[PDB]
Every structure is written in structure tokens, then in C-alpha cells.
Short mmCIF file of C-alpha atoms and ligand atoms in Angstrom, two decimals:
data_model
loop_
_atom_site.label_atom_id
_atom_site.label_comp_id
_atom_site.label_asym_id
_atom_site.label_seq_id
_atom_site.Cartn_x
_atom_site.Cartn_y
_atom_site.Cartn_z
CA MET A 1 35.05 148.84 109.53
CA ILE A 2 31.23 148.75 109.32
CA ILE A 3 29.60 151.44 111.49
CA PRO A 4 25.97 150.54 112.25
CA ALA A 5 23.87 153.67 112.84
CA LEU A 6 20.59 154.71 114.47
CA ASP A 7 18.74 158.05 114.31
CA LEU A 8 16.80 158.93 117.46
CA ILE A 9 13.81 161.27 117.90
CA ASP A 10 12.53 161.48 121.48
CA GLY A 11 13.66 157.94 122.25
CA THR A 12 12.31 156.53 118.99
CA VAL A 13 14.37 154.79 116.29
CA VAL A 14 13.48 156.38 112.94
CA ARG A 15 14.26 156.01 109.25
CA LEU A 16 15.01 158.87 106.86
CA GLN A 17 9.89 159.40 108.73
CA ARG A 18 9.33 155.72 109.47
CA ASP A 19 8.94 154.61 113.10
CA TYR A 20 10.93 151.52 114.17
CA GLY A 21 10.02 151.38 117.83
CA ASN A 22 11.40 152.58 121.11
CA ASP A 23 13.97 149.85 121.68
CA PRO A 24 17.29 151.42 120.68
CA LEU A 25 19.39 149.61 123.29
CA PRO A 26 18.62 145.98 122.39
CA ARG A 27 19.19 146.90 118.70
CA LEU A 28 22.59 148.46 119.43
CA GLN A 29 23.56 145.53 121.64
CA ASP A 30 22.81 143.10 118.85
CA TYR A 31 24.86 145.19 116.41
CA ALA A 32 27.82 144.91 118.83
CA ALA A 33 27.21 141.20 119.40
CA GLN A 34 27.63 140.62 115.66
CA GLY A 35 31.08 142.16 115.75
CA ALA A 36 30.62 145.91 115.18
CA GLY A 37 33.68 147.79 116.48
CA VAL A 38 32.09 151.27 116.33
CA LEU A 39 28.50 152.55 116.40
CA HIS A 40 26.89 155.80 115.30
CA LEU A 41 23.96 157.71 116.84
CA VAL A 42 22.27 160.83 115.52
CA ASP A 43 20.31 162.84 118.06
CA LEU A 44 17.63 164.35 115.83
CA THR A 45 15.86 165.85 118.82
CA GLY A 46 19.02 167.67 119.88
CA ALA A 47 19.66 168.72 116.29
CA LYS A 48 16.32 170.55 116.32
CA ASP A 49 16.66 172.02 119.82
CA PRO A 50 19.94 171.82 121.83
CA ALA A 51 17.97 172.29 125.05
CA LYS A 52 16.31 168.96 124.32
CA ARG A 53 19.55 166.99 123.77
CA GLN A 54 18.86 163.37 124.68
CA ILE A 55 21.80 163.09 127.08
CA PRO A 56 20.08 160.70 129.52
CA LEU A 57 19.21 158.30 126.70
CA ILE A 58 22.67 158.60 125.16
CA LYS A 59 24.22 157.91 128.56
CA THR A 60 22.19 154.67 128.86
CA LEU A 61 22.94 153.51 125.33
CA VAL A 62 26.70 154.05 125.61
CA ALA A 63 26.74 152.34 128.98
CA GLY A 64 24.85 149.40 127.50
CA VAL A 65 27.37 148.43 124.79
CA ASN A 66 31.10 147.57 124.86
CA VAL A 67 32.14 149.60 121.80
CA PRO A 68 32.83 153.30 121.10
CA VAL A 69 29.88 155.33 119.85
CA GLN A 70 30.17 158.47 117.77
CA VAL A 71 27.27 160.83 118.37
CA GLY A 72 26.11 163.87 116.45
CA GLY A 73 23.05 166.07 116.14
CA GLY A 74 23.16 169.84 116.40
CA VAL A 75 26.53 170.11 118.12
CA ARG A 76 26.96 173.88 118.25
CA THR A 77 29.16 174.78 121.19
CA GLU A 78 32.15 173.69 123.21
CA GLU A 79 29.68 172.93 126.00
CA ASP A 80 27.74 170.55 123.72
CA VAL A 81 30.89 168.62 122.93
CA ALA A 82 31.99 168.41 126.57
CA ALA A 83 28.51 167.31 127.71
CA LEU A 84 28.44 164.43 125.21
CA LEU A 85 31.95 163.29 126.14
CA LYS A 86 31.06 163.37 129.68
CA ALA A 87 28.01 161.29 129.13
CA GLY A 88 30.44 158.67 127.83
CA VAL A 89 30.46 159.10 124.07
CA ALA A 90 33.72 158.22 122.33
CA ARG A 91 33.57 160.77 119.51
CA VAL A 92 31.43 163.80 118.81
CA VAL A 93 30.23 164.30 115.25
CA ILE A 94 30.42 167.93 114.18
CA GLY A 95 28.46 169.02 111.13
CA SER A 96 27.32 172.52 110.27
CA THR A 97 29.45 174.26 112.94
CA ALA A 98 32.59 172.90 111.24
CA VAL A 99 31.55 174.65 108.02
CA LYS A 100 30.39 177.85 109.68
CA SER A 101 33.04 178.54 112.38
CA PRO A 102 36.31 176.76 111.54
CA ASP A 103 38.46 178.88 113.82
CA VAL A 104 36.21 177.98 116.74
CA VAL A 105 36.14 174.29 115.87
CA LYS A 106 39.93 174.28 115.35
CA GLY A 107 40.05 175.34 119.01
CA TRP A 108 37.93 172.30 119.90
CA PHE A 109 40.52 170.06 118.24
CA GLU A 110 43.14 171.64 120.48
CA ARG A 111 41.05 171.19 123.63
CA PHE A 112 39.57 167.72 123.08
CA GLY A 113 41.99 166.12 120.61
CA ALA A 114 41.37 164.84 117.07
CA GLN A 115 40.60 161.35 118.31
CA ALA A 116 37.45 162.75 119.96
CA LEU A 117 36.00 164.57 116.95
CA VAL A 118 34.51 163.56 113.63
CA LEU A 119 33.88 166.21 110.94
CA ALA A 120 30.69 165.42 109.02
CA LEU A 121 30.40 167.01 105.60
CA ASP A 122 27.59 166.90 103.03
CA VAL A 123 28.99 167.06 99.50
CA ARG A 124 27.31 167.97 96.21
CA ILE A 125 29.25 167.41 93.01
CA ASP A 126 28.45 170.50 90.92
CA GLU A 127 28.24 170.88 87.13
CA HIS A 128 32.02 171.44 86.93
CA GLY A 129 32.82 168.39 89.06
CA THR A 130 33.88 170.29 92.17
CA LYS A 131 33.07 168.68 95.55
CA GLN A 132 30.92 171.44 97.05
CA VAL A 133 30.27 171.42 100.78
CA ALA A 134 26.73 172.16 101.99
CA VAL A 135 25.49 172.16 105.58
CA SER A 136 22.38 170.11 104.73
CA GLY A 137 20.44 168.54 101.88
CA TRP A 138 17.95 171.39 101.97
CA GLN A 139 20.39 174.28 101.80
CA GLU A 140 22.42 175.73 98.96
CA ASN A 141 26.16 175.18 98.72
CA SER A 142 28.26 177.04 101.28
CA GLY A 143 30.98 178.23 98.91
CA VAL A 144 33.80 175.92 100.02
CA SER A 145 35.08 172.66 98.53
CA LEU A 146 35.63 169.45 100.50
CA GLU A 147 39.37 169.73 99.85
CA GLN A 148 39.57 173.35 101.03
CA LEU A 149 37.72 172.55 104.24
CA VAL A 150 39.75 169.41 104.95
CA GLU A 151 42.95 171.41 104.42
CA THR A 152 41.64 174.01 106.90
CA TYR A 153 41.67 171.41 109.70
CA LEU A 154 44.81 169.40 108.80
CA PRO A 155 46.95 171.85 110.85
CA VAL A 156 45.11 170.82 114.04
CA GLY A 157 45.49 167.13 113.31
CA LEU A 158 42.18 166.18 111.67
CA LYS A 159 41.84 162.36 111.60
CA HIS A 160 38.18 161.52 111.05
CA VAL A 161 35.85 162.76 108.31
CA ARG A 162 32.34 161.47 107.54
CA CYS A 163 31.27 162.25 103.94
CA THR A 164 27.71 162.03 102.56
CA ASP A 165 27.18 162.49 98.81
CA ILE A 166 23.94 164.46 98.55
CA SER A 167 24.05 164.93 94.77
CA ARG A 168 23.74 161.23 93.91
CA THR A 169 22.70 153.84 95.89
CA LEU A 170 26.45 153.32 95.50
CA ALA A 171 26.57 150.17 93.31
CA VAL A 172 32.64 155.79 94.20
CA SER A 173 35.16 158.06 92.39
CA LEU A 174 34.46 160.69 94.98
CA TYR A 175 35.65 158.48 97.82
CA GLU A 176 38.62 157.18 95.80
CA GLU A 177 39.69 160.75 95.04
CA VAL A 178 39.57 162.21 98.55
CA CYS A 179 40.99 159.11 100.26
CA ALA A 180 43.98 159.09 97.91
CA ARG A 181 44.60 162.80 98.45
CA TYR A 182 44.55 162.62 102.27
CA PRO A 183 45.82 159.17 103.29
CA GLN A 184 46.46 160.43 106.85
CA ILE A 185 42.67 160.84 107.31
CA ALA A 186 40.23 158.01 107.95
CA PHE A 187 37.17 158.80 105.83
CA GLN A 188 33.73 157.39 106.55
CA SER A 189 31.06 156.99 103.91
CA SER A 190 27.42 157.64 104.78
CA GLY A 191 24.31 157.12 102.65
CA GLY A 192 23.78 155.10 99.49
CA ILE A 193 23.85 151.69 101.15
CA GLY A 194 20.62 150.06 99.97
CA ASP A 195 21.95 146.50 99.80
CA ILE A 196 24.99 144.36 100.44
CA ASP A 197 26.43 145.04 96.97
CA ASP A 198 26.72 148.74 97.87
CA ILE A 199 29.22 147.78 100.58
CA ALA A 200 31.27 145.64 98.17
CA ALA A 201 31.46 148.64 95.84
CA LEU A 202 33.23 150.71 98.49
CA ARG A 203 35.91 148.06 98.90
CA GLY A 204 39.21 149.26 97.46
CA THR A 205 38.19 152.93 97.43
CA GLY A 206 40.28 153.66 100.52
CA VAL A 207 37.27 154.46 102.72
CA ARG A 208 37.92 153.37 106.30
CA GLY A 209 34.41 153.39 107.78
CA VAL A 210 31.09 152.52 106.16
CA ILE A 211 28.08 153.87 107.95
CA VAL A 212 25.04 151.64 107.60
CA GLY A 213 21.65 152.70 108.90
CA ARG A 214 18.39 152.07 107.08
CA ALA A 215 19.40 148.86 105.25
CA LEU A 216 19.79 147.15 108.65
CA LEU A 217 16.44 148.42 109.91
CA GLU A 218 14.82 147.26 106.66
CA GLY A 219 16.31 143.78 107.05
CA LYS A 220 18.24 143.79 103.75
CA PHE A 221 21.25 142.26 105.47
CA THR A 222 22.70 141.88 108.98
CA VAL A 223 25.68 143.51 110.66
CA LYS A 224 27.49 140.17 110.52
CA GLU A 225 26.93 139.85 106.76
CA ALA A 226 28.04 143.47 106.22
CA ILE A 227 31.27 142.81 108.12
CA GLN A 228 31.90 139.56 106.21
CA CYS A 229 31.44 141.44 102.96
CA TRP A 230 33.61 144.37 104.03
CA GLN A 231 36.46 142.16 105.27
CA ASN A 232 36.06 139.99 102.16
CA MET B 1 38.13 171.12 69.78
CA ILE B 2 39.22 167.95 67.95
CA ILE B 3 43.00 167.83 67.38
CA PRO B 4 43.87 165.42 64.56
CA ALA B 5 47.36 163.97 65.01
CA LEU B 6 50.10 162.27 62.98
CA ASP B 7 53.30 160.56 64.15
CA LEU B 8 56.23 160.85 61.73
CA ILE B 9 59.31 158.63 61.37
CA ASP B 10 61.69 159.74 58.61
CA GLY B 11 58.87 161.25 56.57
CA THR B 12 56.56 158.28 57.10
CA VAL B 13 53.13 158.38 58.77
CA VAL B 14 53.03 155.60 61.38
CA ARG B 15 50.62 154.03 63.86
CA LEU B 16 51.47 153.08 67.43
CA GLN B 17 54.52 150.07 64.02
CA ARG B 18 52.14 150.23 61.08
CA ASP B 19 53.20 152.13 57.94
CA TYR B 20 50.60 154.50 56.42
CA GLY B 21 52.62 155.97 53.59
CA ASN B 22 54.77 158.99 52.95
CA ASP B 23 52.01 161.49 52.24
CA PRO B 24 51.67 163.49 55.46
CA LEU B 25 50.82 166.81 53.80
CA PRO B 26 47.73 165.81 51.81
CA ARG B 27 46.43 164.02 54.95
CA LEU B 28 46.91 167.11 57.13
CA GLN B 29 45.36 169.33 54.47
CA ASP B 30 42.26 167.16 54.39
CA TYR B 31 42.03 167.26 58.19
CA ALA B 32 42.04 171.08 57.99
CA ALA B 33 39.55 171.09 55.11
CA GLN B 34 37.08 169.21 57.32
CA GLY B 35 37.21 171.96 59.90
CA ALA B 36 40.08 171.09 62.28
CA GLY B 37 41.22 174.24 64.12
CA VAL B 38 44.46 172.73 65.51
CA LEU B 39 46.71 169.85 64.43
CA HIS B 40 49.30 167.76 66.25
CA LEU B 41 52.56 166.26 64.97
CA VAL B 42 54.95 163.99 66.82
CA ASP B 43 58.48 163.86 65.46
CA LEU B 44 59.47 160.31 66.42
CA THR B 45 62.76 160.62 64.56
CA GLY B 46 63.69 163.71 66.57
CA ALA B 47 62.52 162.02 69.76
CA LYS B 48 65.11 159.29 69.16
CA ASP B 49 67.92 161.60 68.03
CA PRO B 50 67.68 165.43 68.29
CA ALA B 51 70.32 165.77 65.57
CA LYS B 52 67.84 164.15 63.20
CA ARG B 53 64.91 166.48 63.99
CA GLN B 54 62.70 166.63 60.91
CA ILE B 55 62.70 170.44 60.71
CA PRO B 56 62.58 170.62 56.89
CA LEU B 57 59.55 168.34 56.78
CA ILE B 58 57.86 170.17 59.65
CA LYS B 59 58.49 173.47 57.89
CA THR B 60 56.73 172.17 54.75
CA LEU B 61 53.79 170.70 56.64
CA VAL B 62 53.11 173.86 58.66
CA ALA B 63 53.42 175.98 55.56
CA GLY B 64 50.95 173.71 53.77
CA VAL B 65 47.98 174.14 56.15
CA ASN B 66 46.09 177.20 57.45
CA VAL B 67 45.84 176.11 61.10
CA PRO B 68 48.21 176.09 64.10
CA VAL B 69 50.19 172.89 64.62
CA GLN B 70 51.57 171.75 67.96
CA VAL B 71 54.72 169.69 67.54
CA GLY B 72 56.58 167.48 69.98
CA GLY B 73 59.19 164.76 69.96
CA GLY B 74 62.31 164.84 72.11
CA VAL B 75 62.27 168.55 72.88
CA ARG B 76 65.20 168.82 75.27
CA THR B 77 66.67 172.29 75.07
CA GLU B 78 65.81 175.94 74.66
CA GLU B 79 67.41 175.67 71.22
CA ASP B 80 65.02 172.85 70.24
CA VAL B 81 62.03 174.99 71.16
CA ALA B 82 63.32 178.05 69.31
CA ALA B 83 64.16 176.00 66.20
CA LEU B 84 60.64 174.56 66.01
CA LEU B 85 59.02 177.98 66.49
CA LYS B 86 61.15 179.38 63.88
CA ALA B 87 60.22 176.70 61.46
CA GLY B 88 56.67 177.98 61.92
CA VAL B 89 55.12 175.73 64.54
CA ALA B 90 52.48 177.33 66.73
CA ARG B 91 53.15 175.41 69.94
CA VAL B 92 55.94 173.15 71.12
CA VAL B 93 54.95 170.04 73.05
CA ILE B 94 57.26 169.40 75.99
CA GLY B 95 57.25 165.96 77.57
CA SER B 96 60.00 164.38 79.63
CA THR B 97 62.02 167.61 80.06
CA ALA B 98 59.04 169.16 81.88
CA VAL B 99 59.18 166.33 84.43
CA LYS B 100 62.96 166.26 84.73
CA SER B 101 63.97 169.96 84.78
CA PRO B 102 61.04 172.15 85.88
CA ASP B 103 63.17 175.15 86.79
CA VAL B 104 64.66 175.13 83.30
CA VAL B 105 61.29 174.71 81.60
CA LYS B 106 59.77 177.44 83.81
CA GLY B 107 62.41 179.68 82.22
CA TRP B 108 61.12 178.64 78.78
CA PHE B 109 57.64 179.81 79.78
CA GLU B 110 59.15 183.18 80.63
CA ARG B 111 61.07 183.42 77.35
CA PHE B 112 58.51 182.06 74.87
CA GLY B 113 55.18 182.57 76.67
CA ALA B 114 52.60 180.02 77.80
CA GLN B 115 50.68 180.29 74.55
CA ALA B 116 53.68 178.70 72.79
CA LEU B 117 54.11 175.66 75.03
CA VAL B 118 52.13 172.52 75.77
CA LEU B 119 53.11 170.30 78.71
CA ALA B 120 52.58 166.63 77.84
CA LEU B 121 52.23 164.28 80.80
CA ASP B 122 51.80 160.50 80.94
CA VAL B 123 49.70 159.50 83.93
CA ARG B 124 49.34 156.14 85.70
CA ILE B 125 46.65 155.81 88.33
CA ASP B 126 48.34 153.79 91.09
CA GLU B 127 46.82 151.34 93.58
CA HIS B 128 45.91 154.21 95.93
CA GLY B 129 44.27 156.25 93.18
CA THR B 130 46.99 158.88 92.89
CA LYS B 131 47.66 160.33 89.42
CA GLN B 132 51.33 159.39 89.05
CA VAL B 133 53.40 161.11 86.39
CA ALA B 134 55.77 158.97 84.30
CA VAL B 135 57.98 160.12 81.43
CA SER B 136 56.95 157.22 79.18
CA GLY B 137 54.91 154.03 79.05
CA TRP B 138 58.06 151.97 79.46
CA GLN B 139 59.47 153.69 82.52
CA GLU B 140 58.54 153.55 86.18
CA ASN B 141 56.74 156.42 87.87
CA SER B 142 58.81 159.56 88.43
CA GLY B 143 57.67 160.26 91.99
CA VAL B 144 55.44 163.28 91.32
CA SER B 145 51.67 163.55 90.94
CA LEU B 146 49.91 165.31 88.06
CA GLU B 147 48.56 167.90 90.51
CA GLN B 148 51.98 168.61 92.03
CA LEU B 149 53.56 169.09 88.62
CA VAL B 150 50.73 171.27 87.32
CA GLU B 151 51.00 173.43 90.44
CA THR B 152 54.75 173.75 89.80
CA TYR B 153 54.06 175.57 86.50
CA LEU B 154 50.97 177.62 87.43
CA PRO B 155 53.24 180.45 88.69
CA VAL B 156 54.63 180.94 85.16
CA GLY B 157 51.18 180.97 83.59
CA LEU B 158 50.70 177.37 82.40
CA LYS B 159 47.73 177.22 79.98
CA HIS B 160 47.99 174.00 77.99
CA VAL B 161 48.38 170.45 79.28
CA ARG B 162 48.14 167.23 77.24
CA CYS B 163 47.31 164.19 79.41
CA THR B 164 47.63 160.53 78.37
CA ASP B 165 46.30 157.84 80.72
CA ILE B 166 48.82 155.00 80.45
CA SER B 167 47.27 152.81 83.14
CA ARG B 168 43.98 152.20 81.31
CA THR B 169 39.41 152.86 75.13
CA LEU B 170 37.55 155.66 76.93
CA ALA B 171 33.89 154.58 76.48
CA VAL B 172 36.82 159.72 82.33
CA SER B 173 36.90 160.56 86.08
CA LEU B 174 40.53 161.44 85.69
CA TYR B 175 39.78 164.19 83.18
CA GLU B 176 36.74 165.41 85.15
CA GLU B 177 38.87 165.66 88.30
CA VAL B 178 41.83 167.60 86.91
CA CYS B 179 39.73 169.89 84.70
CA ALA B 180 37.55 170.87 87.65
CA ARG B 181 40.58 171.54 89.85
CA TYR B 182 42.37 173.79 87.33
CA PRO B 183 39.70 175.56 85.26
CA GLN B 184 42.27 178.16 84.10
CA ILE B 185 44.09 175.39 82.17
CA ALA B 186 42.96 173.94 78.85
CA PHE B 187 43.54 170.18 79.12
CA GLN B 188 43.92 167.93 76.10
CA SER B 189 43.16 164.23 76.18
CA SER B 190 45.32 161.80 74.21
CA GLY B 191 44.88 158.06 73.67
CA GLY B 192 41.86 155.83 74.17
CA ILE B 193 39.94 157.03 71.13
CA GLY B 194 39.12 153.81 69.27
CA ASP B 195 35.74 154.92 67.92
CA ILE B 196 33.34 157.82 67.75
CA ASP B 197 31.67 156.87 71.05
CA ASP B 198 34.98 157.48 72.85
CA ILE B 199 34.74 161.15 71.83
CA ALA B 200 31.15 161.43 73.08
CA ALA B 201 32.31 160.06 76.42
CA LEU B 202 34.71 162.98 76.90
CA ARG B 203 31.90 165.49 76.39
CA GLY B 204 31.05 167.21 79.66
CA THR B 205 34.31 166.22 81.37
CA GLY B 206 35.74 169.71 80.92
CA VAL B 207 38.48 168.59 78.52
CA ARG B 208 39.19 171.30 75.95
CA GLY B 209 41.10 169.38 73.28
CA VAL B 210 40.70 165.78 72.11
CA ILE B 211 43.67 164.40 70.30
CA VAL B 212 42.73 161.85 67.66
CA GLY B 213 45.36 159.87 65.78
CA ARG B 214 45.02 156.20 64.92
CA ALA B 215 41.21 156.05 64.64
CA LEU B 216 41.40 158.47 61.69
CA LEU B 217 44.16 156.48 59.99
CA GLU B 218 42.15 153.29 60.51
CA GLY B 219 39.06 154.87 58.93
CA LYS B 220 36.78 154.44 61.97
CA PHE B 221 35.42 157.94 61.48
CA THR B 222 36.38 161.22 59.78
CA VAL B 223 37.54 164.53 61.20
CA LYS B 224 34.20 166.04 60.19
CA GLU B 225 32.25 163.36 62.06
CA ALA B 226 34.50 163.76 65.13
CA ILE B 227 33.85 167.52 65.16
CA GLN B 228 30.10 167.01 64.72
CA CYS B 229 30.13 164.62 67.66
CA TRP B 230 32.28 166.87 69.82
CA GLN B 231 30.18 169.99 69.15
CA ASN B 232 27.03 167.90 69.59
NA1 NA C 301 22.35 180.26 99.38
NA1 NA C 302 62.40 153.55 88.59
#
């Protein structure tokens, strides 16, 4: 499915910064109205300072739509995960902590269940062609491949992985490769959607979810058009 | 390196049939004279009937050049392997038997050493993107992936694998993927070289050996030009 996404800084919708106003709820509602089955929020404020996690805003946004929302942004502890779920989020997106403390995060899978957690990985394809995991675009590789890290969490029932290629718009071997290798996992693609043809290009790769953020804000296409393209 | 190749049927050089004469030795000698470090022969007569293995011809050809030759064609038993080595071949190319009886072939690695054996696999990329092994272009998939079969032989020190893509000329994700995954193995590519640009396209993939057969017979380029291209 198409997964429309917003990034939020102190209540403001931003592009990766470009300011798109302080109306996240009507935007999300219109995404849902066009048929989106899942939405994605990134709490950039919380990612910078966990004490400033925008729980009240997140609570309002979730309450204001009729579809599950996956939310990420500096999720560091068990308490972070529980607080988001409690605020009504459907799935918590775990990024750097999943690279840095797998034994701890494996425990979270056991407590919350794999249906409640999405593992978000940044991938650089190195000179040799290995899928190197990195915790952000501005940090060096962490010394683990995408496959190794995925296989670390398969024993606790990993179901949802969000992959961003940070070595690369999409108009796809990477997605074809990992989706074929782990057909029991639903992979999401993030980044590289500049226009509608980028979505078409992901068709057939095996990717389950296509995250779309800035192209919608920029008015390149609508959620309805993205879904029509995706469903072909 | 470039690995010039000939297929032989009852002493005749053939193209995959087109007849190119009964002068395999002067052809091989000229390949070597242009700088080839390794050559490849396929005994198509032996592949059809082991009793008719062209050992006397192979013995003459090997003796007539100054470079190692890898030879394949219906290698089915330990006795086949030993007979070829004895006739002076440097490496024996094992195809279908490596798919069908891995425990037996693993024993051959222990007896002869990994430097003496090349595993030749035909690969079809299926609808899901899995690298499916098949024993020939005219048979269905065998129910094992390239990765699974490679990992079967890694414990006995597998070093040389010759991969033909039989689902596809090359002008390469497949080669990039497997070479990156198993950097301790020297992979050879076979097929899909129609012109010199097909060799350039394999540069950077991680492939060690590029088998070139029909393009040389057809006069598209020379061994010297292929080597110049490959070495860049
Ligand atoms: Na570093
Ligand atoms: Na069959």
C-alpha cells in the first residue's frame, strides 16, 4: 500500500527545511479520505530531545483519522514505545536503537508484539555491493549488513522493515533482493519518490509499503493517484 | 581474467549448432599467445556419453598450450575427475552432479582439493527474484537457490564457481549480489558476451573470470582486445 508521511517539528509540517504550515490534521485527514490505509509520522522534535516528544499532538492526530499510524522519532526506551502506543499509535518505528541494542529491542518484540513495531534501517551500498546499515545519513556505517540485522530479529518474529537507500529518485535491485530473501517480512520503501513514475518503478519488486512524503507536499501527485498507480 | 572457451563435438569446434572446423589446437594456441591466462573446454561428446569422453584430444590440447585449462562435460564420477586430471587438465568443471549429489561431490573436494574443481551452475531468476539453480536450460528448476548450494560447499573450501544466467547479452545485479556475498569465492561469468561492451559491463561487479566463447569465433573482437578491455 501507499503510506503517506509527514515530518513534524514543534507542530509544524516540514520538508527534508521547508515550512508547510501548522495544519497537520486536515492534511492527514485528506490523505485518509483518498483511500490511504496506513499513515506515517516522524516526530523530529522528539528525535532531538525525548523530553519534548510531541505526545499531545500525536494523540490528536491519531484520534482525528480512521487509519493506523506508524510513528517514529528518537524512540530510545521501552517507556518511549509504551507511551506512543498508549497515545493511540498503531506501530512504533524504531531506528537507531534497533542497530545499537538488538538484545534490548528483541525484548520489546516479546513485550509488545511484532505487529506493533517497525524496524527502520538506513542502507548504503558500499563499493563491494554490500548493503551496509548506518544509523543516519550523517554517520559512518555501523559495521552490520541489512541481511545480518534482519536475521538478528527473525527469531522474535520480525514482520515490518522500513528501508531507506542513503547511497543513491528511484525511476530497485536492492528492494528486489531483500524482499525475495525474506518473503515473510513486509518491507517498506522510503525516499526516492520524486514523481509518480518512481512509484511505478517499485511495482513488482516485492515491496509491500511505499512511503511518500515530500512529493505530496510539493503537489507532484495526490494520494489517490499514487494508490491508482500502485494498484495498477 | 578473460577465459577463452571452445566447445568440442568429436574433434570439431562448435557454436551454441554451427561448425567452425577441426582445428582446436591452433585456435587455443593463438588465444594463449594473446595473453590468456586460463582456457576453458567443454567436451560435448563426453557430456552425451561418458564412454566417448575425448580424453586423447584433451590430452593433446592441454599439452599444446602453456596455460591451465578447465574442462567440463558430463563429469559424473570420481573416476571421470581423476581421468581428466591425469590427462593434464588443471581444473575439472562439475555441473549437474554438483546439484544432484552434493555429499558425493563434497568428498571430491576433500580428495582432489578446491583448486582442482570448478562448480558450474545455471541460474534462472524466478518471478520473486530468487536465484534458482537448474541443471540445464531445458530442465525445470531443481528446488535450490544459488546461495543455498554455494553455502553447501563452503565447508569443504569451495573457491571457484562458474555462473550462467539462463533467464536473461549483458550490456549484472546478479553477479554483483553473489560476488559481494561470498568474497572468498572467485566467480566466473558465462554467456551473454555478444560484443566487447558486454565485457566492460562486468567490470566492477566483482566477477573474477569472464568466459568468452562464441564472440571470439564470430570475430566480434580478439582475445587481446577482450583483455585490454577487462584490465581497463
Ligand atoms: Na565511524
Ligand atoms: Na521438474
